[PDB]
């Protein structure tokens, strides 16, 4: 079974997964599995109630979301959780009539797994939406970095700086929060390293632009050389943001 993708998902699903595995083990053990199971109608109904609620709140997200991919991917998870739930309800019925029911025991395990599995999909789907939001911020900064090439005057540069400053701060904060959430250390490191390189290069870009603007306006020698440092800085930063974008979308083999 796969490692969960973020610390949040892991803290949510890990206890459940653990109890279910415990339940499978008990089931596969003849003497304990063969004992009478008491009436599960009330706890199962409580689970169904909670599934109903989860699905109501889910459908509300569906109608009111911007993300079309979210609209597409969430409903199958609802279906999966509700279907798993009917297995639990059926098990409770069977056991009420026969505490020794074998099919009931199978439904208990299958229903539980189904709820885990579908809740997992639902969480992965919300998580992928969150990542798409981060990526949109990243992509804006990419586009804006292409605009650096047309700053010609000190007044453009102040304006550019006034905008790039915040946008970079926003991306940095988002990436810092996201990396702390990851359960894969290698991914956290790549994110941190890349974001740090981008943070380091930002005042270098501004300098390189100031130098370009100054030599452009002072009609001085070596504007061609200022152009070079400015372009390199935009290229390097962009390469690094595209690497952040690539890493934000990684799921490692132990998840699939």
């Amino acid at each position: 079974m796969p490692v969960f993708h973020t610390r949040t998902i892991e803290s949510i699903l890990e206890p459940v997964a653990q109890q279910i595995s415990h339940l499978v083990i008990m089931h596969e053990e003849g003497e304990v599995d063969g004992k009478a199971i008491p009436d599960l109608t009330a706890p199962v109904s409580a689970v169904q109630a909670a599934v109903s609620n989860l699905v109501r709140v889910g459908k509300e997200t569906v109608q009111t979301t911007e993300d079309q991919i979210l609209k597409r991917d969430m409903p199958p998870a609802f279906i999966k959780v509700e279907n798993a739930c009917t297995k639990l309800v059926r098990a409770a019925q069977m056991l009420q009539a026969d505490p020794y029911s074998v099919p009931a025991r199978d439904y208990l395990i299958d229903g539980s797994r189904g709820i885990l599995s579908g809740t997992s999909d639902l969480l992965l789907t919300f998580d992928e939406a969150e990542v798409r939001k981060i990526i949109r911020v990243c992509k804006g900064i990419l586009e804006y970095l292409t605009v650096a090439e047309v700053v010609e005057t000190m007044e453009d540069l102040v304006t550019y700086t006034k905008n790039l400053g915040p946008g970079m701060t926003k991306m940095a904060k988002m990436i810092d929060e996201r990396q702390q959430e990851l359960t894969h250390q290698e991914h956290r490191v790549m994110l941190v390293n890349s974001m740090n390189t981008v943070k380091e290069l930002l005042p270098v870009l501004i300098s390189a632009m100031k130098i370009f603007v100054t030599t452009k306006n002072t009609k001085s020698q070596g504007i061609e050389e200022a152009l070079k440092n400015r372009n390199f800085t935009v290229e390097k930063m962009s390469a690094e943001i595209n690497e952040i974008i690539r890493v934000l979308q990684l799921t490692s083999w132990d998840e699939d």
Binding site: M26, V32, P43, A46, N53, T119
Partner: peptide
């Protein structure tokens, strides 16, 4: 309300496994 619904769902799941004696009997 989204997070509370997960909490509650996995909470009931927890209790149900307990009814099966998961971490209470066996």
């Amino acid at each position: 309300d989204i997070d509370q619904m997960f909490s509650t769902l996995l909470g009931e799941m927890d209790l149900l496994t307990q009814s099966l004696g998961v971490d209470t009997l066996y």
